[PDB]
Every structure is written in C-alpha cells, then in structure tokens.
Amino acid sequence: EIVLTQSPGTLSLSPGERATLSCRASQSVTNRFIAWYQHKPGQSPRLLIYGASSRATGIPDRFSGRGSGTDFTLTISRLEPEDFAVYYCQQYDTSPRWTFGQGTKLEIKRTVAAPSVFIFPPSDEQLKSGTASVVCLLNNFYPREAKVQWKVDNALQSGNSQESVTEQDSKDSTYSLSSTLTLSKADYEKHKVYACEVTHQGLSSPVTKSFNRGEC
Amino acid sequence: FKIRSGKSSIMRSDAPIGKCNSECITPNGSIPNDKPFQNVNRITYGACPRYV
Amino acid sequence: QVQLVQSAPEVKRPGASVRLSCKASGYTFNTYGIIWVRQAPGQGLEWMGWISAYTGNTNYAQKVQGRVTMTTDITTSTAYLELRGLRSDDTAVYYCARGLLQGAVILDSYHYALDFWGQGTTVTVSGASTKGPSVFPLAPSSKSTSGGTAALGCLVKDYFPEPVTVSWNSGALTSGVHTFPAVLQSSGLYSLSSVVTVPSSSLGTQTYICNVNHKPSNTKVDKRVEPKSC
Ligand SMILES: *[C@@H]1O[C@H](CO)[C@@H](O[C@@H]2O[C@H](CO)[C@@H](O[C@@H]3O[C@H](CO[C@H]4O[C@H](CO)[C@@H](O)[C@H](O[C@H]5O[C@H](CO)[C@@H](O)[C@H](O)[C@@H]5O)[C@@H]4O)[C@@H](O)[C@H](O[C@H]4O[C@H](CO)[C@@H](O)[C@H](O)[C@@H]4O)[C@@H]3O)[C@H](O)[C@H]2NC(C)=O)[C@H](O)[C@H]1NC(C)=O
Ligand SMILES: *[C@@H]1O[C@H](CO)[C@@H](O[C@@H]2O[C@H](CO)[C@@H](O[C@@H]3O[C@H](CO)[C@@H](O)[C@H](O)[C@@H]3O)[C@H](O)[C@H]2NC(C)=O)[C@H](O)[C@H]1NC(C)=O
C-alpha cells in the first residue's frame, strides 16, 4: 500500500524550543489529504491538522502544518509541557483507506542523570512455589538508553529476562527500569553469585550490583 | 559577500506587511492556494495557483 | 457537542466473536460515516474498516477481510463492528471516529478526516483463566545502599486479565512510587512490579505495606515488606 515514513522516530528537545517533524509519502498526494494527529498516552487520539495546513477547531496556534508532494511537515513553536506525545501521519484515498504512520515520540527535557541500581533477591514464598525471580531496579536515570546484563556466577545471561520501562516522570523527567530474571528453583539453587551489570551514559564504568544466594 | 544557490527572490510592491500565514504571496497581497487557478497578478512567489 | 461513546471492555476467548459499539451524539448520523482504527500493544495505529450511514457499503483492510462485518443502525445512531475467529494478535484497543461526508459534495478536508474519537474499547483475547495476583515481597536491601538511601518493592505475578491497582500504605505514600507496566508471560499471565524509594533510617520507624487490587478476581491482597532477617 501507500507507505508514510515518519522522522525522526524519537525527538528530544528542551521546553521552549521549536520542533519539526517530517513525513515522506511513497507517492505524491494532493494536499487535500495527509493529516496530523496527536496521541497522549492513556487518552483518545486528537486531530491537530486537517487538510494539509489547516488547524482544527480549538487547537493552539503554535501547531503549524505545511508541506507538499512527498514531504509534509508539522512545526511546533514554543513547545510546552502539554505537547509531550506521539504524533501520527495520516493519508486518505478514493476507496476509503486511512494509512497511518509509525509515529514520532517527543521525549522532551534533558540533563543527563545517573541510574541508581538496586538488586532484590527472590522471596522465600516464591521459592516455595517453585519459581524464582530476581529483580534489578534502575531508578531515576536519563536518557532512556541503558543496557542490563545478568551474571550468574560470572556467566552472561540471555533469553531468561524481561525488561519494563516507565514513562517520563512528571517532576524530574527521568526514567525507571526493571529487569526481571526468571529461573526455576532447581536452576536457582544451582549457583551462588547473582549480579546485574548496568551500562548507562551517566556512568563512567558499568555498575554491578551483586548478592550471594542464601546469604543476607 | 556570500553567493548561494537559488531559493529566494525579490518583489516590487507597496502593500503592507501583516501577521498571518499564507504559502502564496503576490504583489497585491496573499491569496489562498486552495483554488487551482488565479487571476490576481502574474508575479508570484511560493506555492501558488497558476495564473490565467 | 459531537461525542462518540463506545461499548464496555470485553475479554473473549480464541475463536469467539466480539461485537463492539459506537454511539453518536450531536451530529445527524446519516451525514457522516464512522471508521475504526486499532492499536495493538506497543504498536502504531492501524485502520481496519469504514462504513457509512448514507451508504451501507463497507471497505475493510486486507489483514481482516473475511472476519470483519460492520453494521449500522439509524436508531439510535449506533454503529457495530463484529470480529470473528479472534486470535491472540487481535488483543488491542479499538477506537471509532467520524469520517467522510455523505449527502453533499465537499471542498474542505474536515469532511475527509477523523476529528471526534471515542474513548476506545480494550479487547483482550487469551485462553488463560481469570486468576488473582500473587504478591511476593521485595526485601529492602541490607547494608542500606550508601548513606541515607533505600529501596523496597512488591512483586505481583500470575495475574489475568489486566488491570491491577497497586497502592502503598493505603494511599499514604505517593512519593517515589514507581509501578512498572505489565509484561505478558509466555503462559498467558501477567507479571508486574511496584517499588518505592524510602529513607534508610525510616526502616525501623515506619511500616510499609503494598495494597494490590484485581477487579476481575475480586481479590485484594495486602503484603507488608520488611527487611529479611537471617
Ligand atoms: C456546493 O459548492 C459549494 C462551494 O461553492 C460548497 O459550499 C460548502 O459550504 C460552505 C459554503 O457555504 C463553504 O465552507 C467554507 O469553509 C471555509 C474554510 O473553513 C475554515 O474557516 C471557517 C471560517 O468560518 C471555519 O468555520 C472552518 O471551520 C470548519 O470546521 C467547523 C467544525 O466542524 C465547521 O463547523 C465549519 O463549518 C468549518 O467546516 C474552517 O476553519 C470558510 O472560509 C467558508 O466561509 C463561508 O462564509 C463566508 C461568509 O463571510 C464567505 O465569505 C466564504 O466565501 C464562505 O462562503 C465556509 O465556511 C465551502 O464553500 C464549501 N465547503 C465544503 C466542505 O464543501 C457545497 O458544499 C457544495 N455542495 C452542496 C450540496 O451545496
Ligand atoms: C493587482 O495589482 C495589479 C498591478 O497594479 C493590478 O493591475 C493593474 O490595475 C490597474 C487598475 O485597475 C490598471 O490600470 C488601468 O489600466 C486600464 C487599461 O490599461 C486603463 O484604462 C486605466 O486608466 C488604468 O490605467 C493596470 O492596467 C493593471 N495592470 C498593470 C500591469 O498595472 C491588478 O488589478 C490588481 N488586482 C487586484 C485584484 O487588485
């Protein structure tokens, strides 16, 4: 089908700075189509720009649509905290088909922050159930780029852990991540040293947090 | 001085400058690009209707 | 005002059929059609189908053609989307929005866009039985981090279907509380973790209990978290 490619996928700007988003269409489109939407998390999507460059009713004047042909752009002047969202490209065609876009996320705010790493051992009750979960917590870190590698007796882990990231905090605009290593109780009692090694932009060297099984 | 490629032009007009947003500019003023054709003035800058 | 109201969330099983609703208010129904777009977890918006009140003609997406039937009833301005043979990937949030203009030629592209959306119905399809959460404490780290920092948490595991609401000290503690999004385990169940950062000295001074509620199971579990003693 007609494919609309958005750019950049993630854009980080400081509040009060202009932001320019770019959507390129696979084929030429009459300006009568190609509209721009906003999707704040946990809320219904909103229509910002209909047509090509016409603001929808009750939309702040800062939002400005523009562009023609393959390339279409949305420019936000004087970005404000209300504006943090994911923005979506749209087209239309004669037989009704509304091909959307991948989306661009505005990860506004800045000021690199160092993660606080904590490791939580499996609870005894969970061990009685027969499944063991080890938790590594990264607290209040920016930017979102971080890598966690599990080490079980100095052994690199793969495929037995899941990660989860929170949205940017309202107050300090940092991220928090949880990495859960899931093992069987027998496999858990096979080894002794359990560590999570965290690499992040705000750390000169990787941080390792470790604990010994059956030792508190 | 600095000599660049061609993306800008010059126009002779006495019309005032206003605070609005229109992609097309003619010596008389600014016209919507909605309509495919235009009859205002031959001189144009930007995405504009074709003159007839 | 122009407003769209949608049907309640539904939790079907694989191979079943789900019927979704979109009631319209504030604008005459026959003049504009309603189109449906869905958002799979961690995925972008995807158009599915369009129907018009003026013309019953329906255009469906290639991904879901045989399985989708869209109907409209003029009384009382209600649109229905029926999906059959549901599979796991169908789990998503389904929105409805007003689309094309019918009954008049148009020039302004408002009548070629999607302005007034609905709240959206969240449809979860999985074979897992409804099960209450199991809460296991995450011990405050011994040796008390470095100075005056400390972290403790609760582990919520094997809960289905979403959501769970986790609160600390019966809503007294709202600072430093991070509750991570759920991760879908391979069995079809959900696992979640909620943690909070507390002062190191407060460990003895104050008591910390995590309150977990799972509405589908009618289960509320309170699990105190205290430093492991060996
Ligand atoms: C027949 O052919 C005619 C064309 O000749 C078609 O006429 C249609 O309807 C009217 C004409 O009566 C025209 O719509 C115009 O829209 C523009 C631009 O809209 C923008 O500015 C508006 C300023 O008022 C604003 O209201 C608009 O907001 C839109 O969204 C809201 C919310 O949904 C909605 O309520 C509005 O109605 C808008 O749709 C938007 O920001 C506008 O400039 C036009 O103003 C008219 O009135 C002034 C009076 O001074 C006049 O000077 C203008 O020249 C113009 O006549 C008008 O709102 C437009 O001509 C046609 N629009 C469409 C969508 O077709 C008609 O539809 C054809 N078919 C039939 C069966 O008749
Ligand atoms: C936009 O601006 C142009 C340029 O000023 C306007 O065109 C010019 O308009 C004037 C006034 O109508 C014309 O002058 C008249 O010409 C006729 C015919 O020669 C003559 O009989 C009159 O005595 C008078 O001199 C002029 O010819 C015309 N063209 C040019 C090249 O100047 C145009 O009308 C403007 N458009 C709008 C919508 O205002």
| Calpha distance A7→A103 (Å, rounded) | 8
Query: Alpha carbon C85 to chain centroid distance?
Result: 21
Among B12, B14, B40, B44, say which to mutate for ligand 2: greatest number of ligand atoms within 8 Å of CB. Answer: B40
The backbone region for A146, taken as left when phi is positive above 0, alpha when psi lies in -120 to 50, beta otherwise, is beta
Q: What is the DSSP string of C31-82?
A: GEEEEEEEE-TT--EEEEEEE-SS---EEE-SSSSTTEEEEEETTTTEEEEE
**Alpha carbon separation from C205 to A21, A171, C202, C227, C230 (Å, rounded):** 52, 27, 5, 13, 20
Residue C69 structure tokens: 């039937």
The chain B residues in contact with chain A (CB within 8 A) are 21, 23, 33, 47
Q: Find all residues with CB under 8 Å of A30, minimum gap 6, and list them.
A: none
Residue C209 structure tokens: 């209990």
| Calpha distance A61→B18 (Å, rounded) | 16
Q: Is the CB of C74 under 6 A from ligand 1?
A: no
Judged by CB atoms closer than 8 Å, whether chains meet at A44 and C118 is answered as yes
Which ligand 1 atom is nearest residue C2's CA?
Answer: 33
Q: Which residue of B has its CA nearest to A68?
A: B47
Judged by CB atoms closer than 8 Å, whether chains meet at B21 and A64 is answered as yes
| Calpha distance C8→C120 (Å, rounded) | 9
Q: How many angstroms is it from A55 CA to the middle of ligand 1?
A: 15
Identify the residue whose C-alpha is closest to ligand 1 atom 26: A57
Which ligand 2 atom is nearest residue B41's CA?
Answer: 1
| Calpha distance A91→A108 (Å, rounded) | 27
Which residues in chain A have Cβ-Cβ distances shorter than 8 Å to C180?
164-166, 176, 178
Which DSSP letter does residue A188 get?
H
Q: Which of C186, C182, C78 lies closest to C128, judged by CA?
A: C186
| Calpha distance C177→C170 (Å, rounded) | 13
Instruction: Please name which ligand lies nearest the alpha carbon of A32.
Output: 1
Judged by CB atoms closer than 8 Å, whether chains meet at B47 and A68 is answered as yes
Resolution (A): 4.0
Task: Return the residue matching tokens 């002794």.
Answer: A192
Q: Which of A66, A16, A69, A3 lies closest to A36, judged by CA?
A: A66
| Calpha distance A35→A4 (Å, rounded) | 11
